[PDB]
Amino acid sequence: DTLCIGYHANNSTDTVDTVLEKNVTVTHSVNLLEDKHNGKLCKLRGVAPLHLGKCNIAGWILGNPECESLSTASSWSYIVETPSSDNGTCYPGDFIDYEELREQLSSVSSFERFEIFPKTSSWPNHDSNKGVTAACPHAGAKSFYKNLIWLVKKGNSYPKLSKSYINDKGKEVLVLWGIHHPSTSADQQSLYQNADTYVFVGSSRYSKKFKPEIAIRPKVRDQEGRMNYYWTLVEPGDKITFEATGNLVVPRYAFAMERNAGSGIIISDTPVHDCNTTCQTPKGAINTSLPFQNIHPITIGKCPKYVKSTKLRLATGLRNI
């Protein structure tokens, strides 16, 4: 009559490492490392990402003729840009504090586009129709940004204009405008008859006077002239004034906007999807409880920590025999 004691074993082939020994076969274990994404740009909280498709942030906000058909939204958790998006600033120029703009737009609570300066009642002493160019083509025809109006002089006249809008909204308003720098002094008087002109844009916080820099730049999209793009956020109850003797690409549409800090912009080809996720990567979303992931370093949301590990198998069972 015998009564002994021992342990457990099986067909398990799981191997773990210890401080003292490598490749030790164990009966049971679990993986602490996540290495599997759904390959979908799933949404974050329950809000969907703003996918720009063929356009970038610049093109979308300025109103590039191509960036027509994506923007019927009110909010987004983050912004998605495709690596093959190039429809941005069709007219050559510098977008001042562009990266900053993108960061601020990365996540928006509410977002409505309203006409701040209606084309037809606001610019009565200037031509608001001749402001097109071959640089911003809409099906062959010469067009321009939708959200901006390129004000040229009406039949040999450009009186000092002076419009000013006051934020009657209950949220900040993103106002964009442009300063055009003609290539030649002949182009200058051709567009806004005066030779020595100036633009001034001011609010309770913003204030700057612009002097047109007339010169010949290397042709980019047929234009030897440049166009600098500016923006600002006018506070609720605050007003922004414009004042120009020429060269002012005036705002047409502004954006009532309530933003929440702490999101980003993913540049990826991956498909946008109707799905829920708590952690988003450029390659796909992560649905995980595990502490670590080796999928991608760049991440958005509440994600596992990025590790360079290939495997992190944790032993749960004992040895195997």
Partner 1 sequence: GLFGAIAGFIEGGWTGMVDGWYGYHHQNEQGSGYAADLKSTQNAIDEITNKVNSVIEKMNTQFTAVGKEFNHLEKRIENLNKKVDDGFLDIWTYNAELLVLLENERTLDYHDSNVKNLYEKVRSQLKNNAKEIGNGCFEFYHKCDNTCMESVKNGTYDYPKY
Ligand X SMILES: *[C@@H]1O[C@H](CO)[C@@H](O[C@@H]2O[C@H](CO)[C@@H](O)[C@H](O)[C@H]2NC(C)=O)[C@H](O)[C@H]1NC(C)=O
Ligand Y SMILES: *[C@@H]1O[C@H](CO)[C@@H](O)[C@H](O)[C@H]1NC(C)=O
Residue ranges in contact with ligand X by CB under 6 A: 46, 64-66, 86-87, 90, 136-137, 274-276
One of 7, 9, 10, 17 touching ligand Y (CB under 6 A): 17
Smaller CB separation from ligand Y, 156 or 310:
310
| Smallest gap from residue 234 Cβ to partner 1 (A) | 25
The residue range among 128-136, 172-180, 239-247, 264-272 that interacts with partner 1, by the rule CB under 8 A, is 264-272
Q: What residue 274 binds from ligand X, partner 1, ligand Y, none (CB within 5 to 8 A, per partner kind)?
A: ligand X
Angstrom distance (rounded) from CA 275 to CA 242: 45
Smaller CB separation from partner 1, 40 or 313:
313
| Interface with ligand Y, residue 294, by CB under 6 A | no
Residue 28, annotated ligand binder? Answer: yes
Smaller CB separation from partner 1, 216 or 298:
298
54-65 burial: b if 16+ Cβ within 10 Å, else e: ebbbbbbbbbbb
Q: In this structure, are residues 41 and 49 in contact, taking their beta carbons and an 8 Å threshold?
A: yes
Residue 180, annotated ligand binder? Answer: no
Q: In this structure, are residues 79 and 55 in contact, taking their beta carbons and an 8 Å threshold?
A: no
Compute and round to an integer the Cα radius of gyration of the chain: 28
Q: What would the x/- binding string for partner 1 be over residues 65 to 84, using CB under 8 A?
A: -------------x------
Residues of span 101-160 touching partner 1 by CB under 8 A? 102-103, 106
Q: In this structure, are residues 78 and 277 in contact, taking their beta carbons and an 8 Å threshold?
A: no
| Interface with ligand Y, residue 18, by CB under 6 A | no
| Smallest gap from residue 260 Cβ to ligand X (A) | 14
| Interface with ligand Y, residue 22, by CB under 6 A | yes
Please list the residues that pair with 207 across neighbouring strands: 202
Smaller CB separation from partner 1, 6 or 140:
6
Smaller CB separation from partner 1, 106 or 228:
106
In single-letter form, the type of residue at position 276 comes to N
Compute how many other C-beta atoms are within 10 angstroms of the C-beta atom of residue 215: 13
21-24 own/partner pairs: CB under 8 Å, 24+ apart: 24/315, 24/319
Angstrom distance (rounded) from CA 44 to CA 275: 9
Compute φ and ψ for 127, nearest 5 degrees. -85, 120
Residue 51, annotated ligand binder? Answer: no
| Interface with ligand Y, residue 308, by CB under 6 A | no
Tell which residue, 258, 262, 261, 306, has the closest CA to residue 282.
Answer: 306
| Element at 120 (helix H, strand E) | helix 119-122
Q: What residue 287 binds from partner 1, ligand Y, ligand X, none (CB within 5 to 8 A, per partner kind)?
A: ligand Y
3-state secondary structure of 61: helix
- Where does residue 154 rank: exposed (0-12), middle (13-18), buried (19+ CB within 10 A)? middle
| Interface with ligand Y, residue 23, by CB under 6 A | yes
Phi/psi region, residue 107 (left: phi>0; alpha: psi -120 to 50; beta: rest), is beta
Q: What residue 155 binds from ligand Y, ligand X, partner 1, none (CB within 5 to 8 A, per partner kind)?
A: none
Angstrom distance (rounded) from CA 152 to CA 130: 7
One of 31, 110, 183, 287 touching ligand Y (CB under 6 A): 287
Residues that bind partner 1 (CB under 8 A): 1-10, 16-20, 24, 27, 30, 32-33, 78, 98-99, 102-103, 106, 262-266, 289-292, 297-309, 312-321
Residues that bind ligand Y (CB under 6 A): 17, 22-23, 287
Return binding residues: 8, 28, 273
Return binding residues for Mg(2+): 8, 28, 273
